[PDB]
Structure 1
Amino acid sequence: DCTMYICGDSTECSNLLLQYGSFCTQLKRALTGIAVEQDKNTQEVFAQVKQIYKTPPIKYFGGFNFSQILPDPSKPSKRSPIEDLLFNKFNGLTVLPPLLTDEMIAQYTSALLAGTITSGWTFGAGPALQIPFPMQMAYRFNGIGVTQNVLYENQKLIANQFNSAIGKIQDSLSSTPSALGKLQDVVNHNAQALNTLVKQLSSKFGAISSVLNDILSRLDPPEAEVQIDRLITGRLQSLQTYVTQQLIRAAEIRASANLAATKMSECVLGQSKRVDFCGKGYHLMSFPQSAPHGVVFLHVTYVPAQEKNFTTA
């Protein structure tokens, strides 16, 4: 709110600011647009499913283990262990809460996982069609030029490898110094911007003092007009700088959110033939997970090894 930040509880300051033109309506309009865009971003990213799916009560997927990514009912928040690990790791400046609470973003994530483990990519196009998980893995192998031939003949081996990778991804996320650099940096950027904006209040801006009451008591409105106007224009410039930087940051975040929405629509709800898009190597599957102001993809990919040389013609 421009009046409280710039002027606070002063009447003459508000009257003087009422002349500086619509430099407020524009501020509030821009910030409300940013807030609406932020509330919508999660809608594009997560709300890609019309219906919330639930996993079967018995969880046997042909040897594949999904305990680390499916929600654990023991915790009251109904979050996956990996999501839990990710979650663990005043002058008119209101912070509106997100429309989608973190207890239902996790529910979208759970529905997405249930659909992608119990129905393949079919629920991305139309009605969800049940499909055994080994058959889906055969489909995904067939999608990268490897026939169904070698999936079942290695089904136990691939199940063990996938379980080991899922087990060690938590260790990779934990023991690393800082893997969640982007989310933490976004939060720190917002906090730093707000702190700089607050600390700008105690700035003389070429006036006698940064206190409106002090600049009022020691003078009369005629002579104090110039000083209070200088303070008003300085604080207005600071607010404009803050809102412009916020607009640019929000454009960057909007680009990132569009990228994440495309990543969810291709990597998760289907198989992507693009190279190095859904993780390094040939792409098999992708599992989303929530995170504070962000998303985390587990890109289950297929990487060959142990090559042998031969003569060809």
Structure 2
Amino acid sequence: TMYICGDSTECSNLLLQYGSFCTQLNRALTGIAVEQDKNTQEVFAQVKQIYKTPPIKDFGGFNFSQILPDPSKPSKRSPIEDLLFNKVNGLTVLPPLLTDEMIAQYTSALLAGTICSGWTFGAGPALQIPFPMQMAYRFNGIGVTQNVLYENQKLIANQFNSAIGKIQDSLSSTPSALGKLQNVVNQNAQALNTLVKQLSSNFGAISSVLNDILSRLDKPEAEVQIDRLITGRLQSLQTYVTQQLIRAAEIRASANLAATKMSECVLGQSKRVDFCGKGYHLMSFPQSAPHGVVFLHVTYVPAQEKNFTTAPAI
């Protein structure tokens, strides 16, 4: 009503002739808004208990300082998360049910669980295990014997620590790294700007401004001009809502995929090819981002092959 008529009572009374169109539009946008909170909950609220890491970070040479919360900052976000966050008329914007801090707390709980109890906390009570032994189990999961992990523990820890460092440097120097999240922000801003600019259109009326019509014309003449504006503005609003419903469906599908990855990549070890990164999946770590989630996938990739003669049997 306010978008179409502003505070004009003459317009409002004419708008009533169209029935419940405005009720339908308000309802559709409400449904979308509610869904956005559902999407977030499905992805991040997958842990019953809120876990915290120990004061003593002894993980057998494995360094998680870039993904764990940095206590020296008021936001209590990881170094990587800080980087991610710094890289991205009747109209109002509603706040999310969960704040950025609450989402960060969920992420921290998931990381603390994974690091100290592996995948056990995702299928019941958290069972503690030494990190090196957790990694040994994950090596078995990809068909590699556990002695390979233990014999090369220093090498493996170093390769891991180096790879994580590269992620931080890559993001900080790659303007297009977070294009997927930026595209969502840009599309929504563009849609609202279009909707507002449509209020400048005459749609065949003498003026786009209701106050200018009402101050010049008497009732019967004003009504003719107002009807033209109502028709155009109602059509503009219907166009906006339809596009939002279509975009909302796309985002929902993305959120459903993210929720699946949280369960199958973070809360367990996946055997699905290319589902949790390229190579043989070992484990994954979640990081929060503006209107989205970032997964860091750790995989095992074979190197330096040699040619041998083989036989099916001896």
Q: Normalising to structure 1: TM-score of the pair?
A: 0.98
Residue identity (%): 97
Deviation at 1:292, TM superposition (A): 0.4
Deviation at 1:266, TM superposition (A): 0.1
CA–CA distance in structure 1, aligned partners of residues 59 and 234 of structure 2: 60
Deviation string, structure 1 residues 12-68 (Cα, Å, up to 9, x no partner): 111111121101111111111101100110100000000000101101100000000
Deviation at 1:197, TM superposition (A): 0.7
Deviation at 1:151, TM superposition (A): 0.1
In the other structure, the counterpart of 2:255 is 257
CA–CA distance in structure 1, aligned partners of residues 272 and 90 of structure 2: 47
Residue 73 to residue 90, structure 1, CA distance change in 2 (3 Å): closer
In the other structure, the counterpart of 1:170 is 168
Residue 90 to residue 157, structure 1, CA distance change in 2 (3 Å): closer
Select the residue among 45, 56, 61 that pairs with 1:47.
45
Deviation at 1:225, TM superposition (A): 1.3
Question: Residue 288 of structure 1 aligns to a residue in which SS?
Answer: strand
CA–CA distance in structure 1, aligned partners of residues 14 and 262 of structure 2: 51
CA–CA distance in structure 1, aligned partners of residues 288 and 97 of structure 2: 15
RMSD: 1.5
Contact 2:88 2:290 in 1 (8 A): no
Unaligned runs of 5+ residues in structure 1 are none
Question: Residue 106 of structure 1 aligns to a residue in which SS?
Answer: helix
Which moves more between the two structures, 168-177 or 82-91? Answer: 82-91
Deviation string, structure 1 residues 163-184 (Cα, Å, up to 9, x no partner): 0001110111111131100100
CA–CA distance in structure 2, aligned partners of residues 249 and 173 of structure 1: 27
CA–CA distance in structure 1, aligned partners of residues 171 and 305 of structure 2: 30
Residue 90 to residue 77, structure 1, CA distance change in 2 (3 Å): closer
Residue 93 to residue 60, structure 1, CA distance change in 2 (3 Å): same
CA–CA distance in structure 1, aligned partners of residues 58 and 132 of structure 2: 11
CA–CA distance in structure 1, aligned partners of residues 7 and 51 of structure 2: 52
Deviation string, structure 1 residues 53-95 (Cα, Å, up to 9, x no partner): 0101101100000000000000001000000000011911110
CA–CA distance in structure 2, aligned partners of residues 90 and 132 of structure 1: 37
Q: Normalising to structure 2: TM-score of the pair?
A: 0.97
Deviation string, structure 1 residues 93-137 (Cα, Å, up to 9, x no partner): 110010000011000000000001000000000011111101110
Select the residue among 210, 225, 236 that pairs with 1:227.
225
In the other structure, the counterpart of 1:294 is 292
CA–CA distance in structure 2, aligned partners of residues 70 and 166 of structure 1: 12
Contact 2:208 2:229 in 1 (8 A): yes
CA–CA distance in structure 2, aligned partners of residues 170 and 196 of structure 1: 37
Unaligned runs of 5+ residues in structure 2 are none
CA–CA distance in structure 1, aligned partners of residues 246 and 136 of structure 2: 45
Deviation string, structure 1 residues 255-289 (Cα, Å, up to 9, x no partner): 00000000000000000000001001111111000
CA–CA distance in structure 2, aligned partners of residues 143 and 227 of structure 1: 72
2:182 is aligned with 1:181: no
Question: Residue 295 of structure 1 aligns to a residue in which SS?
Answer: strand
CA–CA distance in structure 1, aligned partners of residues 132 and 231 of structure 2: 67
Deviation at 1:147, TM superposition (A): 1.2
CA–CA distance in structure 1, aligned partners of residues 126 and 287 of structure 2: 21
CA–CA distance in structure 2, aligned partners of residues 101 and 177 of structure 1: 26
Residue 22 to residue 301, structure 1, CA distance change in 2 (3 Å): same
Contact 2:88 2:178 in 1 (8 A): no
Question: Residue 127 of structure 1 aligns to a residue in which SS?
Answer: coil
Aligned positions, number: 310
Contact 2:198 2:233 in 1 (8 A): yes
CA–CA distance in structure 1, aligned partners of residues 51 and 67 of structure 2: 15
CA–CA distance in structure 2, aligned partners of residues 254 and 83 of structure 1: 23
CA–CA distance in structure 1, aligned partners of residues 229 and 156 of structure 2: 67
Deviation at 1:207, TM superposition (A): 1.1
Question: Residue 51 of structure 2 aligns to a residue in which SS?
Answer: strand
CA–CA distance in structure 2, aligned partners of residues 141 and 207 of structure 1: 72
Deviation string, structure 1 residues 198-252 (Cα, Å, up to 9, x no partner): 1111111111110001122221120121210110111011000000000000000
CA–CA distance in structure 2, aligned partners of residues 233 and 123 of structure 1: 57
Contact 2:88 2:182 in 1 (8 A): no
CA–CA distance in structure 2, aligned partners of residues 95 and 110 of structure 1: 28
Contact 2:66 2:80 in 1 (8 A): yes
